[PDB]
Amino acid sequence: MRVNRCIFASIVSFDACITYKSPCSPDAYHDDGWFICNNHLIKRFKMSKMVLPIFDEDDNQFKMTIARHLVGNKERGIKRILIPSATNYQDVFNLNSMMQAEQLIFHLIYNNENAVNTICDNLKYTEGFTSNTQRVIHSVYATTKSILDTTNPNTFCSRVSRDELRFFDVTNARALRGGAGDQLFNNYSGFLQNLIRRAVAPEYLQIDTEELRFRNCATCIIDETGLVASVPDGPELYNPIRSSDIMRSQPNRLQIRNVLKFEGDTRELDRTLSGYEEYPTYVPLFLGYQIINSENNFLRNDFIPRAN
Amino acid sequence: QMRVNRCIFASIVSFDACITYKSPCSPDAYHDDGWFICNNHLIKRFKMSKMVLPIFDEDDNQFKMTIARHLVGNKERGIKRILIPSATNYQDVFNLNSMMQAEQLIFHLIYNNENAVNTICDNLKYTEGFTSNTQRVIHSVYATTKSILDTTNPNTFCSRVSRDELRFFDVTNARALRGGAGDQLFNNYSGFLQNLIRRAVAPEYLQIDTEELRFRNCATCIIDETGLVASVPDGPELYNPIRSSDIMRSQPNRLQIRNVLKFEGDTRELDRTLSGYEEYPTYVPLFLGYQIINSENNFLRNDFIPRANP
Amino acid sequence: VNRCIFASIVSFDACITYKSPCSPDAYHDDGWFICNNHLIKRFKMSKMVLPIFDEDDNQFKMTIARHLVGNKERGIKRILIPSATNYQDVFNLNSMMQAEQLIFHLIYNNENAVNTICDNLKYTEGFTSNTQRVIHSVYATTKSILDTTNPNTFCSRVSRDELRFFDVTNARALRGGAGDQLFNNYSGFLQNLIRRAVAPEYLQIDTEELRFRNCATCIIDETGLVASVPDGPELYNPIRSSDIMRSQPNRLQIRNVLKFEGDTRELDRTLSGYEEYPTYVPLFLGYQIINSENNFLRNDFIPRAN
Amino acid sequence: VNRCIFASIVSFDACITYKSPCSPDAYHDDGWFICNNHLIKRFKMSKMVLPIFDEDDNQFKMTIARHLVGNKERGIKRILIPSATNYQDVFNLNSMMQAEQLIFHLIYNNENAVNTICDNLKYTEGFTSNTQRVIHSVYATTKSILDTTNPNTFCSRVSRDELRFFDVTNARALRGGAGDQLFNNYSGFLQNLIRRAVAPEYLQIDTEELRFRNCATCIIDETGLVASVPDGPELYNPIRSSDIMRSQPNRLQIRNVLKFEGDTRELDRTLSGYEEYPTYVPLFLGYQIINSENNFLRNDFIPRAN
Ligand SMILES: [Zn+2]
Ligand SMILES: [Zn+2]
Ligand SMILES: [Zn+2]
Ligand SMILES: [Zn+2]
């Protein structure tokens, strides 16, 4: 289809004198479970897309989605939040310093209709609203709402794949029961629920009477503040982030940044150890317990909303 | 140069004077990378693979350490999970009285079993062709194995030993420069096996002068009275799908019954939808312990030196 | 002739020869007896000249040094010139070859350690008819320089007109303080090096005060010549790179640099053709009196004794 | 385009014509709105750039000024930027033609003085011919520049990502002392000039303070911006002879200069090789805070308000 499925693809200048670009990277058109491109996922949710190739013992491999968070180990506070909750979202995000269209998209993502109406009224106060700004605002709102219904299981018809269950509190997942984490998860918007399911791979992957443990400890948490990149115990995971993923904005915003460096040649060591299969460090998002029922359609190509 | 085979199991040669034998050591056997075992022999005997763990900083510099992924299935239990058996249970874990001679001699030397290797000599001496080839080949195997072990044994005459590194496997008191039960068991090991554990098992924490770099938030191996084992200090074992094809066929005649796992259903369309994204490997690396680098150190040194604990 | 004190660093083993990296300033007959490269490497200071101008036409330059201590650094990492009772801790002499250790021991008058080095080198084979005369050359050169800067050496002409009080309270009263006592405790070469690196905050010449800075940037406490301000946080002193990277290339060290992000080139061009005010931290402390009749303008080092 | 506020300065009577000797930098959009020549002549300050370096590769420049007040000068001779109350006393407006007086009165918001100058010139029998147009042109240019630098002008951009609290102390976090209110009383152009000339002692970039000087070399008091250290004797500032503008060629000079008698060429040529540490007195005072969200590296000067 070559259709931009990224939710943030509708960003546009509400004023009809400046034309705005479309930095959504190639993956935006790759119709997958994600409804956001890797560039926007990096810039707004501090996550990078990846695939988890689970293998069986003989031939057959199947790949799930996963994300690695880009939170530095030395960060603290609101800087560790990957996906803020509705309460703290307006504080974690600097919505004031963003294009009005992106703010509208964010307000819709968290079901803050009051903010959307405030933006609409503010834009009405301006001149030129009736002719062009109204049309562009309506187009952005329509696209965003359409994506949200696509990812919201509670929409007319909207077939929902209730074959497989997902929890974020393993304390009672094997009992089919949930914790507080999955309650907070249910509080989330459908689009954000799907995004969390895509980004946060389940630490356990019970399939028909078969448990597959992928990690021995979760790397993310679901707390009141939202989906956070803090280990459940001990110092934060060393996550060295370079300027590649950064893709910083505001070329005139002077920002200080404490960055570590390794002093030493390391070239002879690199040459000596080269040729081995490198083990990637990163930090995948592992948390919870996913149950795949005996009867199910789990290799379904087209995305279907998953409701617990 | 790079024409000397550093793998300890390279010397394996049939003691009999007729049947030849060429050990299938991987090319990596020829690199002086601190490993004194090749990747294929590591897989065959210690059930581990050889990987490199690259650690980057925020700037344009990086450095690589060694790490290994064990090849123990989640369903395995008992003495099948043991990667590196201890000096006592090793003869019970390995089936030494099946892998003919030579390799058995190397294994006995690796665990400092003088009596067993002497018994091997006693049995071999009665052969008709002893003073012929047999004695030469046995002596050559012993010499090569002893040289390999001295290269790693820090308590060898004029054996330079690095001491800017401190490695622990107990963590609870590693911040206080003190190890524990796991470290005590580790010290009992042979020098070659101590180096092998240091190479294979990457530290959970890495503390350079003062900055602590945490690589994993939970150890994946353990050092218990039975040795270095691939059991987590938690509930069900990590799902490790053994690549059956990759693992050598060993004995074509021996009939082994293996209950393999099989995923069912078409998955090519899913791969097409998820083709292009960087794949996060599902291997199980060996993470455990705490490694400290003194402010004054020669960590980025090419030549291997035994890293004896202070 | 190389006058850097650290010019004699060699290898006591006969095969490997090591000509210590010395800046071209080593050969100058300036008051310094150390080169800029070695001053940076060991005492973490960079040499500069402070020019003082009259009103119409006459400029005379005094010496000065800027320290290279980051504001974030704390503790024993702030001392530039350690005192003789703590230097073996601040300096990691153990990892400093042997000739450099000998020079450092001589600088601080640690004859015991020098003799220990002597014994250690006598035990080894190939010392008598080889390493001997090499350790001797190192010791002879080091002692020659130290007695050159030591005012008490025999028939050593010593200047006495000019006075230097690192405690400014009673300097106008012709008297030092605790810092000045600690300064007197130092070795002659170290006293000269301090008097060179650390410019005086005040300059009383012909009874005329010429206060240069309004606050000292260093302090002479027990630990030594500390690069610490005696008020509030430390001075922002960014040091970029490529000064001591000669450090053992296999020594893996972590460094917490502080980078600025954003395009500065438009702002740079906006204000480019302006005289730039340097952002280094000079070593200002104390009081210096010229004492009317004197020979301050003499182009040859003479030991200065308070 | 001449941005200097004193650029207009045209003889009100159509007569012998002179152009103000504005320096080349008058044609730079550096945010000074004053040339170095006029800055020196009137506010006894010299322009300079303070480069702040990061640890790796980046450096951003910042404006600064060095005052030209001799240490011996006292009283109203030490004031660089007089307050709106004492300026008619500090400045000899009487001996400043008339266009300079007009500009200065506008700078200090003295519309009464402007009106009396205008009326005195109205009484001229040859007023409406040519003087009215030139007077109005000078007024228009001056008012336009002041509006450019006045944040309260109609729909005028005013950035508030950056906070400049003088007299630091309690002002560190977010406060502002008596000096801060005194500064607030100034005109927008004068506030911009002070903030351009007086670099901040501290610079907290959203978490990280960058102390640039131990003590302030200037102070904001009731008399105005003063070149006086709050620590005792004034800083030695050897203002040379030639660099001073020879405005009045007939005024009797009488100037007590300072001289350094003695040969100094040997020392100069002995130590010429070393990097020189400038002896100018910059203007350090206060505390500048940069918020996490900011446009500080953005050119196209915007008036900054507290
Ligand atoms: Zn996008
Ligand atoms: Zn091998
Ligand atoms: Zn030198
Ligand atoms: Zn001008």
Author numbering:
A (entry chain O): 13 to 320
B (entry chain J): 12 to 321
C (entry chain P), D (entry chain Q): 15 to 320
Q: What does the primary publication say about this deposited structure?
A:
Baculoviruses are insect-infecting pathogens with wide applications as biological pesticides, in vitro protein production vehicles and gene therapy tools. Its cylindrical nucleocapsid, which encapsulates and protects the circular double-stranded viral DNA encoding proteins for viral replication and entry, is formed by the highly conserved major capsid protein VP39.
Here, we present a 3.2 Å-resolution electron cryomicroscopy (cryo-EM) structure of the AcMNPV VP39 protein and its assembly into helical nucleocapsids. In our reconstruction, individual VP39 subunits pack as dimers that assemble into 14 helical strands and together form the central cylindrical structure of the baculoviral nucleocapsid. After local alignment, we estimated the overall resolution of the four-dimer reconstruction to be approximately 3.2 Å. We find that the VP39 monomer comprises a distinct mixed alpha/beta fold, which includes a putative Zinc finger domain facing the inside of the nucleocapsid. The Coulomb potential map reveals strong signal in the vicinity of cysteine 18, cysteine 36, cysteine 49, and histidine 52, which are positioned for tetrahedral coordination of a metal ion. The ZF faces the luminal volume of the VP39 nucleocapsid assembly and is surrounded by positively charged residues, consistent with a role in binding viral DNA. The intra-dimer interface is stabilized by the 75-residue long lasso loop, parts of which protrude into the adjacent monomer of the repeat domain and wrap around its antenna domain.
